[PDB]
Paper text:
Structure-guided inhibitor development can be a powerful tool in targeting GTPases;21 however, in line with previous reports we were unable to crystallise monomeric [name] without substantial mutation to the PPI interface. We therefore designed a novel [name] construct to allow crystallisation whilst leaving the WF-binding pocket free for ligand binding. The C-terminus of [name] SHD1 (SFLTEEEQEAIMKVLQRDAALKRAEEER (residues 5–32)) was linked to the N-terminus of [name] via a flexible poly glycine-serine linker. The unstructured C-terminal hypervariable region of [name] was truncated and a Q78L mutation was introduced in the nucleotide binding pocket to promote adoption of the active GTP-bound conformation. We termed this class of constructs fusion-[name] (fRab27A); variants bearing C123S and C188S mutations (fRab27A), as well as single mutants specified by the presence of the wild-type cysteine at position 123 (fRab27A-C123) or 188 (fRab27A-C188), could be purified to homogeneity and form protein crystals which diffract to high resolution (C123S, C188S, 2.32 Å, Table S1†). fRab27A adopted a closely similar conformation to the [name]-[name] co-crystal structure, with average root-mean-square deviation (RMSD) of 0.554 Å. Importantly, the structure leaves the WF-binding pocket unoccupied, as designed. Covalent ligands are increasingly used to target challenging proteins. fRab27A contains two cysteine residues (C123 and C188) in close proximity to the WF-binding pocket, which are mutated to serine in crystal structures. The novel fusion construct presented here provides a new tool for structure-guided drug discovery efforts against [name].
Author numbering:
A (entry chain A): -37 to -7, 5 to 59, 65 to 188
B (entry chain C): -37 to -9, 4 to 56, 62 to 188
């Protein structure tokens, strides 16, 4: 399989890298917040990574499929409270990777910048669920820490008539790898905040203990 | 200069990334004091892979094997401040492809670099004229405002084919305030010096933090 990038696509990717470098250089000055926290969404093409992040940052949802050109990221400013009987201002950088195999090496090159991973499959696509095992072993091999923080999302929960992944099977996978699991919908917002706030909690607690 | 990627090339790149992650995970788990990373860049053919290989192994291959996107080498060295006490340094030497079809992938590794070894080929005028473009790329894409850069005019052993005048290269390096070495990966001339100068810049910038 040969893949290609047009000039326009190379241009778009370089712009993402340019925005990223500008963001990191501005943290080197005022590191208007307390932490820059970075995580990365991954999983098969079409499962809803881009929609999930857009629902989270803007509360909006597009029906039209615009497959991601390699890599992108979004930003959000949130307040984090140490979960338990406890406010830190968090600048979130949300990396959005393409799922298509043609972008595997480019997207894996950004794992080094990720403190945690939002891993998606599509509740209506059984193969995307069967590939979760491969995504996890790719994360074991390519993450830059031992035992990376991962939150698993079974997305498109609003499409009940098309659901093919049984809750029991997804639960069994989450227990086997010891990772949290949420069933989400980027269309209506269900559990989006909850899944991403849990990932942020995992990251913040791991830093405090280090 | 159409941008394409094959499956076998992705596999090779993914192996480098796998090696990289293993190295980073092993530093977090010693035998040295710092993991110091820098990155070689410049036009295809100027000798980036050759320079790093001469430095780490004292060897040189005549045959051109263009780099498949990205690679890195390693070396364990002792660094002395300016003297000072010997610090054990684990070097990770990133090697980027110069061809445009790898530009996005290679630029994605600037973030891991504490310093840059920028090469042109003393026998290739185009590679010298592209130096200012590479410096501009580093300003736009490095993850600090004034990245440390050492400029190498490589292939100094090819005297009859030399076309870049030393005065012009010295003046270009002085304009940007970067050190300049004329190197040969074939016979080793100035390789150690240029890379030790880059390491010095990085270690001294850290000490001031
Ligand atoms: N009904 C419904 N549709 C969704 C949901 N999430 C995504 N979609 C739809 O599914 C399609 C794929 O979504 P998209 O976010 O682009 O997926 P992706 O994971 O980013 N794909 P890629 O990796 O190729 O960039 C789009 O048509 C989008 O509208 C969801 O929760 N519910
Ligand atoms: N005579 C001589 N040949 C050199 C020198 N440095 C590199 N070469 C030769 O020039 C060719 C290109 O060298 P190479 O290190 O592969 O260049 P590169 O910068 O890594 N190219 P790429 O970006 O495509 O990977 C090879 O044939 C190599 O042997 C040098 O100092 N002297
Ligand atoms: Mg997408
Ligand atoms: Mg090379």
């Amino acid at each position: 399989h040969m893949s290609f990038l047009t000039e326009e696509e190379q241009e778009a990717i370089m712009k993402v890298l340019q925005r990223d470098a500008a963001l990191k250089r501005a943290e080197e000055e005022r590191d208007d917040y307390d932490y820059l926290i970075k995580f990365l969404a991954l999983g098969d093409s079409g499962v809803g990574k881009t929609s999930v992040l857009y629902q989270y940052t803007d509360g909006k949802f597009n029906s039209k499929f615009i497959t991601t050109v390699g890599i992108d990221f979004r930003e959000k400013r949130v307040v984090y409270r140490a979960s338990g009987p406890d406010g830190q201002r968090i600048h979130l950088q949300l990396w959005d990777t393409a799922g298509l195999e043609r972008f595997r090496s480019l997207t894996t090159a950004f794992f080094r910048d990720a403190m945690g991973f939002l891993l998606l499959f599509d509740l209506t696509n059984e193969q995307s669920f069967l590939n979760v095992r491969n995504w996890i072993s790719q994360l074991q091999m390519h993450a830059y820490s031992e035992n990376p923080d991962i939150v698993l999302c079974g997305n498109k929960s609003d499409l009940e008539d098309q659901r093919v992944v049984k809750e029991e099977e997804a639960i069994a996978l989450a227990e086997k790898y010891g990772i949290p699991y949420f069933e989400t919908s980027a269309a209506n917002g269900t559990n989006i905040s909850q899944a991403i706030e849990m990932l942020l909690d995992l990251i913040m607690k791991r830093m405090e203990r280090s």
